[PDB]
Protein backbone atom coordinates (compact mmCIF):
# COMPACT_ATOMS: atom_id res chain seq x y z
CA UNK A 1 0.00 0.00 0.00
CA UNK A 2 1.43 3.43 -0.86
CA UNK A 3 0.59 6.36 1.29
CA UNK A 4 -0.57 10.05 0.06
CA UNK A 5 2.98 10.90 0.10
CA UNK A 6 4.61 8.01 -1.30
CA UNK A 7 6.06 5.43 1.61
CA UNK A 8 5.17 1.49 1.56
CA UNK A 9 3.42 -0.33 3.40
CA UNK A 10 3.33 -4.63 3.78
CA UNK A 11 0.92 -6.84 4.31
CA UNK A 12 -0.44 -9.96 3.01
CA UNK A 13 -4.22 -12.01 2.92
CA UNK A 14 -5.68 -14.60 2.31
CA UNK A 15 -6.76 -15.72 -1.17
CA UNK A 16 -10.54 -16.03 -0.52
CA UNK A 17 -10.39 -12.30 1.04
CA UNK A 18 -10.88 -8.74 -0.70
CA UNK A 19 -8.62 -5.88 -0.61
CA UNK A 20 -10.03 -2.89 1.32
CA UNK A 21 -8.03 0.35 1.35
CA UNK A 22 -7.75 1.92 4.88
CA UNK A 23 -8.23 6.11 5.14
CA UNK A 24 -5.06 7.80 4.35
CA UNK A 25 -4.15 5.18 2.40
CA UNK A 26 -3.92 6.34 -2.05
CA UNK A 27 -3.62 2.90 -3.78
CA UNK A 28 -2.10 -0.43 -3.60
CA UNK A 29 -0.59 -3.07 -5.79
CA UNK A 30 -0.79 -6.75 -4.97
CA UNK A 31 0.32 -10.02 -7.30
CA UNK A 32 -2.75 -11.11 -9.44
CA UNK A 33 -0.10 -14.59 -9.88
CA UNK A 34 -0.48 -17.39 -7.39
CA UNK A 35 3.14 -16.96 -6.78
CA UNK A 36 4.89 -16.12 -3.50
CA UNK A 37 7.91 -14.54 -3.94
CA UNK A 38 9.77 -16.60 -1.02
CA UNK A 39 12.75 -18.35 -2.89
CA UNK A 40 12.61 -15.88 -5.77
CA UNK A 41 12.28 -12.13 -4.47
CA UNK A 42 10.35 -9.74 -6.62
CA UNK A 43 10.80 -5.88 -6.44
CA UNK A 44 9.14 -2.79 -7.30
CA UNK A 45 11.07 0.43 -8.44
CA UNK A 46 9.13 3.10 -9.52
CA UNK A 47 10.36 6.64 -11.23
CA UNK A 48 9.34 9.83 -12.54
CA UNK A 49 9.16 10.63 -16.56
CA UNK A 50 8.06 13.37 -18.50
CA UNK A 51 4.90 14.64 -18.45
CA UNK A 52 1.86 14.11 -20.76
CA UNK A 53 1.21 16.41 -23.51
CA UNK A 54 -2.08 17.67 -21.92
CA UNK A 55 -0.26 18.41 -18.47
CA UNK A 56 -1.07 15.14 -16.65
CA UNK A 57 2.07 13.89 -14.83
CA UNK A 58 3.19 10.02 -15.72
CA UNK A 59 5.89 7.58 -14.13
CA UNK A 60 7.59 4.32 -15.13
CA UNK A 61 6.75 1.42 -13.01
CA UNK A 62 9.04 -1.14 -13.33
CA UNK A 63 9.51 -5.01 -12.03
CA UNK A 64 12.29 -7.23 -11.08
CA UNK A 65 13.19 -10.74 -10.17
CA UNK A 66 15.97 -11.49 -7.68
CA UNK A 67 17.28 -15.07 -7.08
CA UNK A 68 18.92 -16.23 -3.81
CA UNK A 69 22.47 -15.76 -5.26
CA UNK A 70 21.87 -12.40 -6.84
CA UNK A 71 21.04 -12.52 -10.06
CA UNK A 72 18.72 -9.64 -10.84
CA UNK A 73 16.68 -9.81 -14.16
CA UNK A 74 14.15 -7.29 -15.90
CA UNK A 75 10.86 -8.80 -15.98
CA UNK A 76 8.39 -5.86 -16.88
CA UNK A 77 8.18 -1.89 -17.61
CA UNK A 78 5.20 0.32 -17.39
CA UNK A 79 4.09 4.12 -17.75
CA UNK A 80 1.24 5.02 -15.54
CA UNK A 81 -0.60 7.83 -14.55
CA UNK A 82 -2.62 8.53 -11.72
CA UNK A 83 -4.74 11.33 -13.70
CA UNK A 84 -8.55 9.73 -14.55
CA UNK A 85 -7.62 10.62 -18.29
CA UNK A 86 -3.87 9.99 -19.42
CA UNK A 87 -2.64 8.93 -22.58
CA UNK A 88 0.46 6.88 -23.11
CA UNK A 89 3.29 7.82 -25.88
CA UNK A 90 1.38 4.85 -28.35
CA UNK A 91 -1.99 6.74 -27.26
CA UNK A 92 -3.17 3.99 -25.16
CA UNK A 93 -4.38 4.58 -21.52
CA UNK A 94 -2.09 5.21 -18.87
CA UNK A 95 -4.90 4.91 -15.62
CA UNK A 96 -3.21 2.45 -13.17
CA UNK A 97 -6.03 -0.61 -12.89
CA UNK A 98 -6.96 -0.61 -16.51
CA UNK A 99 -3.23 -0.40 -17.80
CA UNK A 100 -2.56 -3.17 -15.25
CA UNK A 101 -5.31 -5.38 -16.04
CA UNK A 102 -4.53 -4.76 -19.62
CA UNK A 103 -1.05 -5.24 -20.58
CA UNK A 104 0.25 -7.37 -17.30
CA UNK A 105 0.58 -10.58 -15.97
CA UNK A 106 2.06 -10.37 -12.68
CA UNK B 1 3.49 17.42 -40.20
CA UNK B 2 0.80 17.64 -37.83
CA UNK B 3 1.60 14.23 -35.67
CA UNK B 4 0.26 13.45 -32.38
CA UNK B 5 1.21 10.57 -30.48
CA UNK B 6 1.12 7.92 -33.67
CA UNK B 7 -0.84 9.10 -36.02
CA UNK B 8 -0.76 11.87 -38.70
CA UNK B 9 -3.76 14.56 -39.99
CA UNK B 10 -3.52 14.46 -43.32
CA UNK B 11 -6.01 16.46 -45.52
CA UNK B 12 -9.29 18.20 -44.10
CA UNK B 13 -12.05 18.51 -47.43
CA UNK B 14 -15.48 19.66 -48.11
CA UNK B 15 -18.75 18.11 -49.71
CA UNK B 16 -21.93 19.08 -50.70
CA UNK B 17 -24.73 16.95 -49.90
CA UNK B 18 -28.30 16.75 -51.44
CA UNK B 19 -31.29 15.74 -49.47
CA UNK B 20 -34.17 15.51 -51.95
CA UNK B 21 -38.11 16.56 -51.76
CA UNK B 22 -41.13 14.82 -53.23
CA UNK B 23 -41.97 17.79 -55.30
CA UNK B 24 -41.73 17.03 -59.50
CA UNK B 25 -41.80 19.42 -62.68
CA UNK B 26 -42.10 18.64 -66.07
CA UNK B 27 -42.23 19.99 -69.52
CA UNK B 28 -45.24 20.05 -71.99
CA UNK B 29 -45.94 18.46 -75.38
CA UNK B 30 -47.70 22.03 -76.23
CA UNK B 31 -44.03 23.63 -77.86
CA UNK B 32 -43.42 20.78 -80.12
CA UNK B 33 -45.95 21.41 -82.30
CA UNK B 34 -45.52 25.31 -83.15
CA UNK B 35 -41.07 23.58 -83.57
CA UNK B 36 -42.40 21.45 -86.04
CA UNK B 37 -44.77 23.92 -87.94
CA UNK B 38 -41.44 26.68 -87.54
CA UNK B 39 -39.19 23.85 -88.99
CA UNK B 40 -40.75 22.97 -92.02
CA UNK B 41 -40.84 26.42 -93.51
CA UNK B 42 -37.24 25.91 -94.30
CA UNK B 43 -37.41 23.03 -96.53
CA UNK B 44 -39.49 25.86 -98.88
CA UNK B 45 -37.15 28.44 -98.23
CA UNK B 46 -33.70 28.85 -100.28
CA UNK B 47 -35.18 27.52 -103.79
CA UNK B 48 -35.45 29.88 -106.77
CA UNK B 49 -36.85 29.75 -110.48
CA UNK B 50 -34.28 30.63 -112.92
CA UNK B 51 -36.90 31.05 -115.95
CA UNK B 52 -40.40 32.93 -115.24
CA UNK B 53 -42.88 30.58 -117.21
Given at each position: ??????????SA?????E??????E?????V??????????????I???????????????????????????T???????????????????????????????? | ????????L?????????????????????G??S?L????????D???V????
Open positions: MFDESGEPAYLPYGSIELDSGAFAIYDDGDPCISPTRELTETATADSAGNERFLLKLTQTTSLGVVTLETHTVSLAEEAKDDMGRLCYLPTALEARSKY | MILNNQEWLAIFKKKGLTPTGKLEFATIDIDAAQALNEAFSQVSFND
